[PDB]
Design a protein around this motif. Sequence first.
Motif, PDB file in Angstrom:
ATOM      1  N   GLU A   1      15.822  -9.233  -4.227  1.00  0.00           N
ATOM      2  CA  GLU A   1      17.097  -9.349  -4.926  1.00  0.00           C
ATOM      3  C   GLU A   1      17.372  -8.069  -5.706  1.00  0.00           C
ATOM      4  O   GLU A   1      17.450  -6.987  -5.128  1.00  0.00           O
ATOM      5  N   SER A   2      17.516  -8.193  -7.026  1.00  0.00           N
ATOM      6  CA  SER A   2      17.293  -7.042  -7.892  1.00  0.00           C
ATOM      7  C   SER A   2      15.807  -6.869  -8.130  1.00  0.00           C
ATOM      8  O   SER A   2      15.381  -5.936  -8.821  1.00  0.00           O
ATOM      9  N   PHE A   3      15.021  -7.822  -7.619  1.00  0.00           N
ATOM     10  CA  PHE A   3      13.592  -7.649  -7.384  1.00  0.00           C
ATOM     11  C   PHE A   3      13.320  -6.335  -6.673  1.00  0.00           C
ATOM     12  O   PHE A   3      12.455  -5.562  -7.088  1.00  0.00           O
ATOM     13  N   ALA A   4      14.084  -6.049  -5.612  1.00  0.00           N
ATOM     14  CA  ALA A   4      13.886  -4.823  -4.849  1.00  0.00           C
ATOM     15  C   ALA A   4      14.394  -3.597  -5.604  1.00  0.00           C
ATOM     16  O   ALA A   4      13.827  -2.512  -5.480  1.00  0.00           O
ATOM     17  N   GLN A   5      15.479  -3.749  -6.367  1.00  0.00           N
ATOM     18  CA  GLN A   5      16.014  -2.626  -7.107  1.00  0.00           C
ATOM     19  C   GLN A   5      15.054  -2.223  -8.197  1.00  0.00           C
ATOM     20  O   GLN A   5      14.625  -1.064  -8.265  1.00  0.00           O
ATOM     21  N   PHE A   7      12.040  -3.050  -8.144  1.00  0.00           N
ATOM     22  CA  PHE A   7      10.868  -2.625  -7.415  1.00  0.00           C
ATOM     23  C   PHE A   7      10.962  -1.150  -7.089  1.00  0.00           C
ATOM     24  O   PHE A   7       9.980  -0.409  -7.203  1.00  0.00           O
ATOM     25  N   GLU A   8      12.166  -0.697  -6.766  1.00  0.00           N
ATOM     26  CA  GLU A   8      12.366   0.700  -6.441  1.00  0.00           C
ATOM     27  C   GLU A   8      12.193   1.576  -7.661  1.00  0.00           C
ATOM     28  O   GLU A   8      11.480   2.580  -7.598  1.00  0.00           O
ATOM     29  N   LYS A  12       9.439   4.412  -8.359  1.00  0.00           N
ATOM     30  CA  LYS A  12       9.782   5.728  -8.886  1.00  0.00           C
ATOM     31  C   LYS A  12       8.946   6.038 -10.111  1.00  0.00           C
ATOM     32  O   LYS A  12       8.452   7.160 -10.273  1.00  0.00           O
ATOM     33  N   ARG A  17       6.458  13.983  -8.298  1.00  0.00           N
ATOM     34  CA  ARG A  17       6.551  14.916  -7.175  1.00  0.00           C
ATOM     35  C   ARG A  17       5.307  15.785  -6.907  1.00  0.00           C
ATOM     36  O   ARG A  17       4.960  15.918  -5.720  1.00  0.00           O
ATOM     37  N   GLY A  39       1.577   7.067  -0.664  1.00  0.00           N
ATOM     38  CA  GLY A  39       2.813   6.375  -0.928  1.00  0.00           C
ATOM     39  C   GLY A  39       4.045   7.174  -0.607  1.00  0.00           C
ATOM     40  O   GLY A  39       5.061   7.030  -1.293  1.00  0.00           O
ATOM     41  N   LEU A  40       3.989   8.016   0.409  1.00  0.00           N
ATOM     42  CA  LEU A  40       5.115   8.835   0.808  1.00  0.00           C
ATOM     43  C   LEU A  40       5.554   8.369   2.176  1.00  0.00           C
ATOM     44  O   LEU A  40       5.179   7.275   2.604  1.00  0.00           O
ATOM     45  N   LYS A  41       6.357   9.185   2.852  1.00  0.00           N
ATOM     46  CA  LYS A  41       6.962   8.731   4.089  1.00  0.00           C
ATOM     47  C   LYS A  41       5.946   8.653   5.208  1.00  0.00           C
ATOM     48  O   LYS A  41       5.806   7.623   5.867  1.00  0.00           O
ATOM     49  N   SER A  42       5.225   9.721   5.436  1.00  0.00           N
ATOM     50  CA  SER A  42       4.253   9.702   6.504  1.00  0.00           C
ATOM     51  C   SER A  42       2.880  10.006   5.968  1.00  0.00           C
ATOM     52  O   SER A  42       2.621   9.886   4.772  1.00  0.00           O
TER      53      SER A  42
END
Lengths: 351, 88, 226
Positions: A1-5, A7-8, A12, A17, A39-42
Amino acid sequence: ESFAQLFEESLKEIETRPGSIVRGVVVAIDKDVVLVDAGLKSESAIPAEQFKNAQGELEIQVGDEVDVALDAVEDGFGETLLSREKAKRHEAWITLEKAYEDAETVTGVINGKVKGGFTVELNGIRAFLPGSLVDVRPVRDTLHLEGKELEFKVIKLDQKRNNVVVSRRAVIESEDPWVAIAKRYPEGTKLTGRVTNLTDYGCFVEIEEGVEGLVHVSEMDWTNKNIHPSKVVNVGDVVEVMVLDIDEERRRISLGLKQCKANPWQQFAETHNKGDRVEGKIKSITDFGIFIGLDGGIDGLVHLSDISWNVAGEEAVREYKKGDEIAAVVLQVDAERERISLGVKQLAEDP
Amino acid sequence: SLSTEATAKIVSEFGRDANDTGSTEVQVALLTAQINHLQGHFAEHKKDHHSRRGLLRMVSQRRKLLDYLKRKDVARYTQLIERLGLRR
Amino acid sequence: MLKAGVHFGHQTRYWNPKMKPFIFGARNKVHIINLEKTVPMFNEALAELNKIASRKGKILFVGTKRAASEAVKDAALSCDQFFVNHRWLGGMLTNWKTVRQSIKRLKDLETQSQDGTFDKLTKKEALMRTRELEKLENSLGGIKDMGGLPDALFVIDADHEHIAIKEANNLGIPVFAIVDTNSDPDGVDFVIPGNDDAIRAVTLYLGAVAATVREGRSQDLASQAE
RNA sequence: CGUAAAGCGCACGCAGGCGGUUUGUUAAGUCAGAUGUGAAAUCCCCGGGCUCAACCUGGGAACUGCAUCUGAUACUGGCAAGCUUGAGUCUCGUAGAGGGGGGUAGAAUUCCAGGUGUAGCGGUGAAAUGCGUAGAGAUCUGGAGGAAUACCGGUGGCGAAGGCGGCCCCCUGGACGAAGACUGACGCUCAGGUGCGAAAGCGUGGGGAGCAAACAGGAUUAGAUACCCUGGUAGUCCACGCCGUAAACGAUGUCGACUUGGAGGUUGUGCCCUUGAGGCGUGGCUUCCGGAGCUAACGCGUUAAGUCGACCGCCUGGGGAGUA
């Protein structure tokens, strides 16, 4: 829900970086490629050479955690810049603590100055410092037992370009690059610089606080043209380089790298060039006027057809010696200019 | 080129106040003062075609404003061309 | 939910603008795929997989990606399904009429070389016929036991195997793919917006598909009948 | 109507055409009905008569129209009153080879005078014509004169187009943006007309370094009225007039609206941690690559050759001919 927001923004909050948060677990090892997942893309294609410590063999199995680095994203497919630089930040922190501590105590062992300051090496890495930093006074570690154990007391650091000269022995004692480009100038100040990208004519070693050096292809080695710099040095590695040239306009510091095994060639001219020393050497290609023995670390063209026996002209060396064989041959001349040693083979026992 | 004191003088002289600067009599008066200023510049120099195109531009601009004002209110049209001095 | 694998978002700037419904521009100039919209599409995909695999249909798994190579073989031989992971041959589906006898060369050649004349002619002939088997083996090995046209195509990168998608859109096969941000969701019927280049992701998506397949083929109805 | 034939070289601009938005009035356009008329024959429909048909003929329909009266007022137009988004004005700046006039600087080329010095110089694919023992070429000092402005120089900038590069002054045009205020449709296009319009050329008067048609000579070649070389006059330059054409090209008329993206350049500006060449937006002009869409294809692709609207110019097989 805003669970994911939420979560994002949480995720972060629980990453940054640079190579700061030791997060990538080594999830497959194969020589010669390590790979993590921070925890990055690849998953990173890690070299093995960012992870072996100080004698050559690996240190970390599966599950182990080092941070890498970032701020560069997607060259096609993949993710990172290497974790070894990570390490540099840790080194900086320890140096800061010493500066911060008011001092830093470890071990520093500095045998000699490539460019006027003994080299100090801390743990795996070795750094170069300005000439004063090695010794507190005029003591000089040349009389000290070689590669001696002290610590490093800092003498001088350049704060932008990374050069640190540190204090061996004497425990008791306790716009921007281009205006004043006269520090590493004067003819041949050796530097320790990481190479960046090798452009098939060059290598681009550039370290000293926002400059560009080349070491293009002509020196690099003691062969001129057939060299292809990717074969001969590395990618991303801190090397022997010095300036040889700084051009004030056009902003092209033209460094070099032959200032090394040049000395080996000189030693060959000397070492065995004292008079007429005998050498056991192997021929490689006989070119109708000689035999070209080329043993002993890159010393080029040698014995002429004129000696070879006690007959002058008729001999044709393919008939008389061999292909690929180790022989008697002694020096008879080393010419310092134009790089011609001229060995012989008539110095034997027939007459 | 038609300095700010001159423009404020013409706005205050032909308009309602120092704020009504875009009315038709004001725009015609500023274009007329500009043209009559540049007649001294094209008396000599005789060949500045790239500036004379700007002059012809503001001439036609003045003419279309006067055509609008003649179409709307003939009273202020006669008061403007007689107060200002034009029509051949 | 980023459940166990990290399938957050991708590349930087060369996004296909058709995927405007799945974007969040992060601070590092990188897109974030809408993970709260990914999951309904993925469940709409698995609800199709249980139907067409409980049809007793054949799924064909496609992904090369240099990293999802072994995850397809490992995560697809766990089911009774078929895979293409090394090289996608041009026309394995719409020119399967002539891919067929190349499969006959593979099966009919390992039949000769497991017991037959794998030593009877020449060491050089073993170096030829064996090299032929290792050339066809990681080119047709997963599709070898299929013997028909597949009923579905599970593509892991639309941008990398876009000719497999158009391949199985000349004929009527419902393809569906997990797309990247730069991929094109046009031939894909059941688009799955997510991560194509993570080993965690091609473990997760392909693993849940692998659960829907073997968990989907009725082990319950059959039992009841028995 | 980019390349097949075809977008004026580029603008301004009268008549002409077209016109944002609200309210009221009018009913001109427009719509509806009615009346008169639209001759008969002819066409068409349903019948009738010639033994059938052609043919003749009854009734209708139609005669796409014009006029008048009565209404409808959504649109268009006329009139009155507005409104601000289109357009325009003002206050700050910003960049720019935009234009006209004046002045000045350095390098170089040529010549002249002088010095040192002597046997070649110059040129070519090779050569010769040419210049030089009357002192050349080179080198140095001085002077004269003319022309163009290296580097910066940037698929950068400005201009309607042509076009505009040292530096400084004077006079002057346009564009852009931020925040407001003001006028209230004042707008777009434009046949005829008027204006600007590279180079060559023509007229008058100056000026003439370098270059350079014509011309001479040497080569080359079978020939060589050519390319190559040595010279060299108009012209190139300035002032004032004329000419009015160019592959005047983006081979793409102007204006306006709308329609996925990316990488850059240049030029303003807003906010925030300018705390670091930082991050997020915002306008203008511009370069490339590509999406749908379009196209005969090539390619174009938010600066369209995509979807549309207003106005103008132009095309209708090739040659004859943009000729008489």
